[PDB]
Amino acid sequence: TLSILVAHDLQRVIGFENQLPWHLPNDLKHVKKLSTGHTLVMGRKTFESIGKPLPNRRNVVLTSDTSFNVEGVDVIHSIEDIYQLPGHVFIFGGQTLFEEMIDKVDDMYITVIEGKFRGDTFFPPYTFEDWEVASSVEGKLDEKNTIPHTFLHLIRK
Ligand SMILES: NC(=O)C1=CN([C@@H]2O[C@H](COP(=O)(O)OP(=O)(O)OC[C@H]3O[C@@H](n4cnc5c(N)ncnc54)[C@H](OP(=O)(O)O)[C@@H]3O)[C@@H](O)[C@H]2O)C=CC1
Ligand SMILES: CCc1nc(N)nc(N)c1C#C[C@@H](C)c1cc(OC)cc(-c2ccncc2)c1
């Protein structure tokens, strides 16, 4: 299974100056629950913005840099290498990897952040004409999660 995992706003903003524009604990839990025990594939800039692998799953980084070798991270150098990865693989960002992979994935786990933020990186445009809504669940608002948000699971038709 090859999936996209992404959070984007009403205009498909995903990032700003190598950071997420929002702070949403419910979304991090969501990500943990989905990917624990599986594989995350991410671009080099995305990895460096956090700088540490996420524990309890395989962390894979795509980069042209043949000197890359981080403790607890696996490296690949070609998009083609993604297909050799075993198990459930989640394309985890950022913009460049999303653009490269959106036409190739089976399904998408999207957190729609119902706001308009300033961004410099975007999720590519897509149409529901090509994607069936397997599920759509509103996030609960509270003290620490104060932006409305919706978890979508979309499956390519
Ligand atoms: N809201 C969300 O769900 C998410 C948001 N983000 C955000 O996205 C932004 C970063 O996106 P972006 O700038 O596009 O960077 P990326 O994370 O997509 O990294 C780009 C780098 O990945 C490597 N790479 C990509 N494709 C290839 C390839 N085909 N072959 C070899 N290497 C490749 C290259 O590394 P190299 O230059 O070393 O060769 C390239 O420079 C940040 O703001 C981040 O916060 C990221 C993930 C999720
Ligand atoms: C969650 C934000 C998020 N939400 C959703 N729905 N999809 C995503 N793909 C991401 C994401 C992401 C990237 C920036 C990312 C990569 C990473 O590579 C290790 C670690 C984290 C991370 C480690 C720990 N705490 C917060 C974030 C985030």
* DSSP secondary structure of the chain: -EEEEEEEETT-EEEBTTB-SS--HHHHHHHHHHHTTSEEEEEHHHHHHH-SPPTTSEEEEE-S-TT---TT-EEE-SGGGGGG--S-EEEEE-HHHHHHHTTT-SEEEEEEE-S----SEEPPP--GGGEEEEEEEEPPP-SS--S-EEEEEEEE-
Mutating to test ligand 2, I would choose from 18, 20, 39 the residue with most ligand atoms within 8 A of its C-beta, which is: 20
Inter-residue contact 16 to 94 (CB < 8 Å) = no
CATH number of this structure's domain 1-157: 3.40.430.10
Which atom, in ligand 2's list, is nearest to the CA of 40?
18
From the CA of 40, how far away is ligand 2's center (Å)? 10
From the CA of 28, how far away is ligand 2's center (Å)? 7
Domain boundaries along the sequence of the chain: 1-157
- How many angstroms separate the CA atoms of 75 and 65, rounded? 9
The separation between the first and the last C-alpha atoms of the chain, rounded to the nearest angstrom, is: 15
Is 23 a pocket residue for ligand 1 (Cβ < 6 Å)?
no
Residue nearest (by alpha carbon) to ligand 1 atom 10: 94
Which atom, in ligand 2's list, is nearest to the CA of 93?
9
- What is the resolution in angstroms? 2.2
